[PDB]
Ligand binder design. Structure first.
Ligand SMILES: CCCCCCCCCCCCCC(=O)O
Ligand SMILES: CCCCCCCCCCCCCC(=O)O
Ligand SMILES: CCCCCCCCCCCCCC(=O)O
Ligand SMILES: CCCCCCCCCCCCCC(=O)O
Ligand SMILES: CCCCCCCCCCCCCC(=O)O
Lengths: 242, 52, 278, 242, 242, 278, 52, 242, 242, 52
């Protein structure tokens, strides 16, 4: 026999092993692969697809209505429409989206994200909106004067119903932590703020609905990636399923 | 075979001296079903009437 | 190297099932593929394409799981001798007829030429048959016809100078070994329409072909056993040639050395109350 | 010694292993292989051989008579001769044939099947018969009008004693399940119906036998295969054979 | 370390293993091989050497005399000299010869055997002898008329003292079983009969010895072989030798 | 590589048995193949074809199971020393004469040159000889003639600075090792018609060739044994040269170091009542 | 040898330094039966009478 | 993982193993090898060096004097000077020499040995000496007439102070046993006798020392070798050294 | 399976093993390596950097002042400034330097060392100093007359503030032991003495500071190396850190 | 390396997929001690006076 020295790690089972193993049915010949539409080779093809933010997460809003941010006729200038901490982890609105639910399976992320907004008011309803991205270091911008100092787009309601604010990868490091784990101070990875402001006002003809909606949508850009698989927090069980 | 479809392609490596030690043979061998299905002196082509 | 090339055989399972050619309608008195004559003993020659209008089908299905090698090429139980603590010795007569699954699989053929891989699992237990701890070597000795059999655990026959033996541990990995085709005949016989002896027609020697019988495996522990040991003997048939298919066994097996069956109720499939409903 | 790491599955015995193993008689030289007629390399050579259906499985019929379906002079038009659920598994008439007994050893099947019928009446006995195959989805056809809507052949009794109804592989999937396992809903794989009808009538000269027989025979076509070996249900034992 | 999977048969000791194993004295340099006469490479070189049959195995004959079959002046015609069941196993006269003692170590045999007989009467003693080999199926031939129907030689006593009856390999199968194991019905392998008869008579001058001897000798032909080593029955011990 | 080619020897067993040529009838005074003369000491030259009318037979049978290598090339028991718990030390004198099966197989030859594979199985048991659990290292020390023998379990001889030793576990796999041909002579001798010493003709030194004796194996446990240990010592003879075949042993063996036999009843094969019936 | 008939064909691979470590030799060696069967100065051909 | 079958001898420790094994300091770089005089590659270079026999081993002689064999003026003719059993083992005078102490580590020996004798008398002291080697089979030669029948040299005292008696390898076998193990009858390997005799006499001028000495020296010839290491008998300990 | 023989050392864990081992995250793709200044490939790049000797190790001197050897105006000739046993081990002043702290991790050393001294007196302060290295064998040199017999440099205070005394590798052996382990007599490796003397005197203008300082610095030369990692003596813990 | 002197010569053989699985690297890499010992804009050759 060939002299050998089995070493440490002998007979262990690692769940991420990449080893060949004997087939219990070595003569089996599977059914052919047929053409099926929509073959996926990499889950970042899904992450680049837009999905709707559960953006209207105010206490008391249930169901489909959590998907429409209110936008109204204002009686005061430069008012705020929306505020959102840029986070792939945690439990805020981004966490339940396609990108957010993929991020639940991963520990680290990098790359640019885009947010596409669609206005749902009547044809006759006009308005201009400021969408701002504030890099980290401080708090959420308090007024439109402070928010405009950051990356921002200005949206004119019109025939083209939707706008994109690209949130570019602006970062001290090549990767950030998905989670906000407190004991581990993963707030170190704070990724900034997204805020929405009235650039002029929502204006309506007499007797029209004085309230309309924005449907926010989010997706990853082609420069985006995830590392380190991890267990999804909110997919649990207390018993074996029967 | 890192896969063609229904082609299993195996290198049987016997480590012992006697051929009986080798693992099982994976070749497909010739099938002559007609020694059992058409065991008759005169061939009967499908399109013909069998008798006469 | 070429010498190592001798110890490697590239062998391929890529035989496919038959395909289907598209066909169209036929209105003629020329070609009558559906008319048959079962009296000749030939199976029908009519095919799909000549009976209905078919599409084209490219063959994709393999046939290898029904190759004789694949059908026999797995391990099955063939012997379960129990080593008691009173004598610490047991034996198993070598043939594939104690356990019905392998025997019934073999009953599809008349003559069979093969090699065997044997696998032995030893299990220790108490008198009430509950698993128990016992670490001991055991010895399996091949005793061919005419070699004296051991009569005790300490018999000097277990020297094993000429009988081959395997020594393994009761709580170690299973003993395993291969065997070439050993018959004096050019194949084994699954069924034998004759007598074991000249000048004798005793019913107990009808159907007994002694060229299938290569002798005995004998079993002791190397010390006197503290608990009973059960050896499970598995055989995998390999490198298999098969001739002359048969009507397979349908009645249950009753005896080890003959085909006796009950035959009280002559039927195999279940009954119904009417042939024109289920 | 060469450093190694034995992994999981060490020292296991799998019954379908394909491994070389030391020969206990390494100097043995077997007897030559001689020519024997009828060498079989693949059990689908057996499955393509016709065998007789235990087709007359009515309660009370015993022995050889279970192999002959009665055919009589009818006093009414368009009557039914036979009905059979197309099934390689279970315990109906197909289960005891050569193809059915091979199917007992396998879990899955694909391909076309043919049924050859031989009439056994007198030379002077005439008749025409309709043999129908109904694809699944519903019940057994209730009358000859409904059965004729399917695949079917029409058989004229004459010099050529026998007919073939080819039951073609008509199937949503590449393979079906052999068994009808209830807990697992293998009735999903229902494969249709075979029925036999009087196309005209059986007609006899005065005082001839008013009853004759069909011997049904079945076999696989060359496009047929089996997968997944499995234990045969009805080959059992309660004790070791002595 | 190289990933491995030790399988079944690990750590077993098989007595017929063909494996290399570490040498406890790896620097030792043995004495040269010198020429010695009579090197043996294969035990069938011994089996082809003639040895004397313990042929006169009658109850009461001891010692060297068991090696001489009596031959006498007969007072009746066509008398029998000897009878012997052709068997390499068992315990009859062939079992103690060189070929028989080699057969004790083997389970199966094939090939032709020859028996050489040497007459030991006086120079003046004449005779003719019939040596018969009867293939199996029945009993020992009862009279010289029945024995002559088989393979046979007719021996004339003269200057050339000896004769050979070649017992040719006549056999349904390529090999026979050495043993006559009853439980296993190895009488299936019955190999026939050898008998010796007076072809004329032994004739002597007045007052010569009216009894002389045949020394029977046996050996294997070059077409002979053995299979399956097995333990020798009669080489036993009840205690360790001291 | 060629260097690894040095460690591989392609070796072939393909020697066949002799075939048979067809022959026809012969009526002549020219050729008399059946007339022999055993007085010369030559074996008969007559063959099948010259004695009867033969058919042609193509040779198909091998001869390799009776090659001297194959005949000796398996393991057999040669020593069974028992290590008691009082001193935890034992030894075995190294020769193949305690157990009769290997000794009788060797008695077919005069001189034998071989290597040895030794295999040692240790088994622990109680005083009543029932298998028991005991995990301990043991030491087998080769003690050649003139090396001081250990007298206790803790003797400093077990240092083993110059004697080779093998250490293995009682409940581990069997110790195994090979040995070259070690005789001072150019072969071993199975039988010796001489005296072990000059100036001495004591019967106890007749038939004693001390060049067959390479010394002792000594056995201790590395701690004091709790239960008795039985070592079974197996030898497989390999790379075998054999000279001068003999009449094989027929009487049972009685003593380890000489050929003494009973010889009370001078016969080997069994008796019958009449030479002309069975 | 994945099989010719009665030809066992083996590559003995010794992993240790000493030739004595190698497994058993599978060669068939020359047989000279006549040094034991015909050990006589004058050859006696089968068809001749032995004496004289 | 690669399928394997660990066999017998697994996990054993043999003291003569020749196996590679992991280095506990794999980055260490040793000091260079410098030139040192007197490098030894093989202990037979030592065995070919002459050393002094402890030849005067008479009871009562202690210390350096055990190295000088007495030689005296004789008053009788043909007297014996010395007698010595030729043995590399045991405990006689050869056992404590360089060759003898090397032989203590080995079991078997072969080859020629030489014995060099140096006379130590005064310049004016004359003599002739017979040195004999008697091959084995009998006893020590009893008189100079019997000893001269063997291999022998005749030594004339003179300017060249020393003589060599070459004891040639004369032996039935290629090797002998070093030891004289009684239970194993290693006296089988008896290697003969060395004796020394007065060939004429030791003659002195008046009043000179009437006693002088021979210093015997021994070494191996270039055709000599040892086999089978073994433990040295007389290098023992009863306790661990502290 | 391939026949094998696991040998001794099976399943052991050696802390200096050099073996590949399965990666628990085999699909991970790390962040790129960026340029960072000051990449170190070998700790002897650090050992060649000068560091300050904790040279003023007199009882009672604490803190930064332990780094300045006093130098004063002398009232007597040829006085001693400093004395130091040349030792990489132990606990004297060299032990806390960069070279000394690296030597704490190693067992053996070789090569030349240099000591650079910087004078810190006023611009107007003059002096000449003798720096001596005495190879081992005796004690510390007692007077400047004895010290000058060794390797030595003579330092003139001036514009170039600093001097180097190169302590060359002068040694019977290629390597020395770092430690002074008493039980093991590692004083065998005594490496000599460094002493500092007034070559003339420190001279000052009236009313200047009559005391100034030398800052001693040490580093390894390019011919220096370390062997055998070992645990650092003074980096201990009594509890797990929390 | 069956030995040159102070040259360890190793064939690192990684059996696993990820480079991180490989054993430790035995190469000696370039040493630039002068980025730490001579970290100054103007080189000062040994034989010169350092200041001015
Ligand atoms: C120890 C020598 C290593 C040789 C084994 C190489 C791997 C075995 C070959 C397997 C060939 C069939 C595998 C496949 O392609 O499906
Ligand atoms: C233990 C080594 C030699 C044992 C030989 C076993 C060979 C078994 C073949 C059995 C073939 C006949 C099967 C049967 O009679 O039912
Ligand atoms: C343990 C290592 C060295 C032991 C040497 C064993 C060699 C045994 C050969 C025995 C040959 C003689 C056989 C006999 O005398 O019956
Ligand atoms: C670890 C190196 C692998 C080399 C072993 C390759 C397999 C052994 C060769 C066996 C050659 C004879 C086998 C045969 O053809 O019957
Ligand atoms: C299982 C494949 C075997 C390949 C391993 C061959 C031996 C490893 C190479 C070691 C190279 C450095 C050794 C050295 O020269 O110091």
């Amino acid at each position: 026999g060939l002299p050998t020295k089995p070493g440490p790690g002998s007979y262990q089972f690692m769940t991420t092993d990449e080893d060949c193993s004997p087939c219990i049915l070595p003569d089996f010949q599977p059914t052919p692969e047929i053409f099926i539409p929509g073959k996926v080779n990499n889950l970042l093809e899904i992450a680049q697809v837009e999905s709707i933010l559960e953006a209207n997460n105010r206490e008391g809003v249930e169901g489909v209505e959590r998907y429409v941010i209110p936008v109204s006729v204002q009686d005061a200038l430069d008012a705020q429409i929306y505020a959102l901490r840029l986070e792939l982890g945690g439990s805020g609105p981004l966490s339940s989206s396609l990108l957010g639910t993929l991020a639940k399976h991963y520990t680290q992320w990098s790359g640019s994200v885009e947010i596409t907004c669609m206005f749902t008011g009547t044809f006759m309803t006009t308005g201009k909106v400021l969408l701002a991205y504030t890099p980290p270091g401080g708090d959420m911008p308090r007024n439109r004067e402070e928010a405009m100092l950051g990356t921002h787009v200005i949206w004119d309601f019109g025939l083209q119903s939707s706008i994109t604010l690209v949130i570019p990868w602006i970062s001290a490091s090549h990767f950030r932590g998905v989670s906000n784990d407190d004991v581990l101070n993963y707030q170190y990875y704070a990724a900034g703020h997204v805020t929405i402001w009235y650039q002029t006002n929502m204006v309506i003809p007499p007797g029209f609905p004085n309230t309309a909606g924005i449907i926010m949508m989010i997706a990853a850009q082609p420069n985006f990636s995830f590392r380190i698989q991890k267990d999804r927090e909110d997919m649990t069980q207390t018993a074996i399923l029967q | 075979g890192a896969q063609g479809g229904s082609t299993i392609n195996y290198n049987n490596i016997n480590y012992y001296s006697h051929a009986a030690s080798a693992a099982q043979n994976k070749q497909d061998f010739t099938q002559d079903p007609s020694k059992f299905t058409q065991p008759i002196a005169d061939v009967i082509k499908e399109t013909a009437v069998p008798l006469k | 190297g070429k010498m190592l090339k001798d110890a490697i055989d590239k062998q391929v399972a890529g035989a496919l099932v038959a395909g289907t050619t598209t066909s169209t309608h036929s209105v003629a008195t020329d070609s009558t593929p559906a008319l048959q004559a079962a009296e000749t003993g030939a199976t029908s020659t009519a095919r799909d394409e000549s009976m209905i209008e078919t599409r084209t089908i490219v063959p994709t299905h393999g046939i290898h799981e029904t190759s004789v090698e694949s059908f026999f090429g797995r391990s099955s139980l063939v012997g379960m001798p129990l080593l008691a603590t009173g004598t610490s010795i047991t034996h198993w007569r070598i043939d594939f007829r104690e356990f019905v699954q392998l025997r019934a699989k073999m009953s599809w053929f008349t003559y069979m030429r093969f090699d065997v891989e044997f696998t032995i699992i030893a299990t220790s237990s108490t008198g009430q048959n509950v698993t128990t701890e016992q670490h001991t070597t055991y010895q399996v000795m091949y005793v061919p016809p005419g070699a004296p059999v051991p009569s005790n655990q300490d018999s000097f026959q277990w020297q094993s100078g000429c009988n081959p033996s395997v020594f393994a541990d009761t709580d170690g990995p299973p003993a395993q070994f291969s065997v070439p085709f050993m018959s004096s005949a050019n194949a084994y016989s699954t069924v034998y329409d004759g007598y074991a002896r000249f000048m004798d027609t005793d019913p107990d020697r009808y159907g007994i072909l002694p060229s299938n019988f290569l002798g005995f495996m004998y079993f002791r522990t190397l010390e006197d056993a503290a608990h009973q040991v059960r050896f499970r003997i598995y055989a995998k048939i390999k490198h298999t040639s098969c001739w002359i298919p048969r009507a397979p066994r349908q009645a249950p097996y009753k005896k080890r050395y003959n085909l006796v069956f009950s035959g009280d109720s002559d039927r195999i499939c279940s009954n119904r109350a009417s042939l024109t409903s289920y």
